C-alpha cells in the first residue's frame, strides 16, 4: 500500500535543521535509511527493528533517527553542511515467509546544502517554434523547450496544451547538463521536445506552455543581493499556433 517520503527536493543553506519524513501503511516492523551520492552506490546509514529500536549503519553520518510509531521513521540533521548533499532513501520489510524478503522503497528526498547562497539561480525558460522546413517535409511539428542557467540541480519540466498537461509526443533529457563542466558550482541546462501534427500547430487558436518547476530558496532564507530572491517558483514560456 506504498511508502511515502517528503519533501521530494530540498535546497537549504549551511547550519540549518532538516527533518526527512518517511511513513508506511503496510505495517512492517523493519525500516531503513540508505544514502546514495552522485557517485552511484547505496550505503546503509540507519535501521530500526521496531518501536524503540534505532541502530547506526555501515557508514557513519551526523544524523539521527526516531521510531515512536510503527508507521513513521523520521531522520534529523541537526546542522547542515555541504558534506550532506546527497539522496536519502527510506525502505521497509516483513518478517514472515512466502515470497520472503526484499525491501520496499520510498522515492527519496534529494537534498543539496549550499555554502554560498549567491550561487543559487532560477532558470530562464524559452520555447522554440517548430521549423517550417520540418512541417513541409514531414507533416509534423516539433516544439523544443530550453531551460538554462539554473542552480542547483532540481527542476521538473512539463508541457501544457490548451491548459491541460500532455505526455503524448513528449521527450525530456534524462538529466540536466553542466553549462561549465569544469566548475564545482556550475549552473545547468535542460531540453524537452513536443511533437504534434502540422495541422494542429497551424491552428492559430492552440496555446502551448512549457513550465519549469524550480526548487530553491525558502521565503525567509536570508538574502541581501540585488537580483530577486531565487525562491522555489515556476517559470513559464508560451507560444501560439500560427495559421499558414
Amino acid at each position: 500500500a506504498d511508502i511515502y517520503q517528503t519533501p521530494r527536493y530540498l535546497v537549504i543553506g549551511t547550519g540549518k535543521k532538516i527533518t526527512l519524513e518517511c511513513s508506511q501503511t503496510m505495517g512492517h516492523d523493519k525500516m531503513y535509511w540508505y544514502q546514495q551520492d552522485p557517485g552511484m552506490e547505496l550505503h546503509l546509514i540507519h535501521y530500526s527493528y521496531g518501536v524503540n529500536s534505532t541502530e547506526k549503519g555501515d557508514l557513519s553520518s551526523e544524523s539521527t533517527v526516531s521510531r515512536i510509531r510503527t508507521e513513521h521513521f523520521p531522520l534529523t540533521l541537526e546542522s547542515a553542511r555541504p558534506s550532506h548533499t546527497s539522496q536519502y532513501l527510506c525502505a521497509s520489510s516483513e518478517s514472515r515467509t512466502g515470497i520472503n524478503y526484499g525491501y520496499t522503497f520510498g522515492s527519496g528526498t534529494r537534498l543539496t546544502v549550499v555554502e554560498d547562497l549567491n550561487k543559487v539561480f532560477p532558470p530562464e525558460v524559452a520555447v522554440f517554434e517548430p521549423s517550417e522546413a520540418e512541417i513541409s517535409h514531414t507533416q509534423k511539428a516539433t516544439l523544443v523547450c530550453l531551460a538554462t542557467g539554473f542552480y542547483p540541480d532540481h527542476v521538473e519540466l512539463s508541457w501544457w496544451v490548451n491548459g491541460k498537461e500532455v505526455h503524448s509526443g513528449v521527450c525530456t533529457d534524462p538529466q540536466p547538463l553542466k553549462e561549465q563542466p569544469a566548475l564545482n558550482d556550475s549552473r545547468y541546462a535542460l531540453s524537452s521536445r513536443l511533437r504534434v501534427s502540422a495541422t494542429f500547430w497551424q491552428d492559430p487558436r492552440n496555446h502551448f506552455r512549457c513550465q519549469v518547476q524550480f526548487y530553491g530558496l525558502s521565503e525567509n532564507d536570508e538574502w541581501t543581493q540585488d537580483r530577486a530572491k531565487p525562491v522555489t517558483q515556476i517559470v513559464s514560456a508560451e507560444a501560439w499556433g500560427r495559421a499558414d
Binding site: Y34, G102, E129, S131, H137, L146, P174, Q175, R193, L194
Partner: protein
C-alpha cells in the same frame, strides 16, 4: 559499464560480491529515484525465472547474472545487485555499483534531418534539432565548450503508431549556424 540495446534484444547484467551469503537479490532503480525488487535466489539454488527475468548464481566464484529476454522500452533502468548475509538476528542487505540499461525501439522509416528553430519571443536565440534518425546513429558530444549537445531522446506518438529520436544543440556564439553542429 552502461548498456544500450535494441528492444526485443537480450541483456546480461553481471555482478560480483566479497563475503559469502545465503540469499542474493536484484533490484532496478527508476529514474535515479525509487528501487523495486525484481527476483531472489537462495544459496542452494542455481537458476530462477520470473517471466522475462532469468537469474544465475554460483558460490564457487561469488558472482551472479541476470538475463532479460525480449526487451521493452519499459526495461530501461539501472540495475543493482544486492547480497544478503546475517547471523540469525540481523539482515544487512548491501548494494552493488549499478548498471545503466537503455532499451531503444526500431525506427520504421528513418528521415535524418537537422533543423534550426527560432524563439517565439522576439530574440535572436535559436536551437538546432537533429531528428528522425535511425537507432544505430551516434550523437557525438561537442569538441567545443561553447557548443552544447544533448543526449539522444525517443518520443512516442501513439495515435499514429510512430516514434522518433531527437537531440538538441544550441550555443551562445554570434551567427551560430546549425549547418555543422552535430557533424560526426
Amino acid at each position: 559499464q552502461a548498456l544500450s540495446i535494441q528492444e526485443g534484444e537480450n541483456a546480461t547484467m553481471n555482478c560480483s560480491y566479497k563475503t559469502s551469503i545465503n540469499n542474493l537479490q536484484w533490484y532496478r532503480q527508476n529514474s535515479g529515484r525509487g528501487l523495486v525488487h525484481l527476483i531472489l535466489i537462495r544459496s542452494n539454488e542455481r537458476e530462477k525465472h520470473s517471466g522475462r527475468l532469468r537469474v544465475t548464481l554460483d558460490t564457487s566464484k561469488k558472482s551472479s547474472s541476470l538475463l532479460i529476454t525480449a526487451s521493452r522500452a519499459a526495461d530501461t533502468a539501472s540495475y543493482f545487485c544486492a547480497p544478503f548475509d546475517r547471523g540469525s538476528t540481523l539482515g544487512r542487505l548491501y548494494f552493488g555499483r549499478g548498471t545503466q540499461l537503455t532499451v531503444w525501439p526500431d525506427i520504421q522509416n528513418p528521415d535524418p534531418a537537422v533543423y534550426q528553430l527560432r524563439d517565439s519571443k522576439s530574440s535572436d536565440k535559436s536551437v538546432c534539432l537533429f531528428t528522425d534518425f535511425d537507432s544505430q546513429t551516434n550523437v557525438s558530444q561537442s569538441k567545443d565548450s561553447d557548443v552544447y549537445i544533448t543526449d539522444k531522446c525517443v518520443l512516442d506518438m501513439r495515435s499514429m503508431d510512430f516514434k522518433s529520436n531527437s537531440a538538441v544543440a544550441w550555443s551562445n556564439k554570434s551567427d551560430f549556424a546549425c549547418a555543422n553542429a552535430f557533424n560526426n
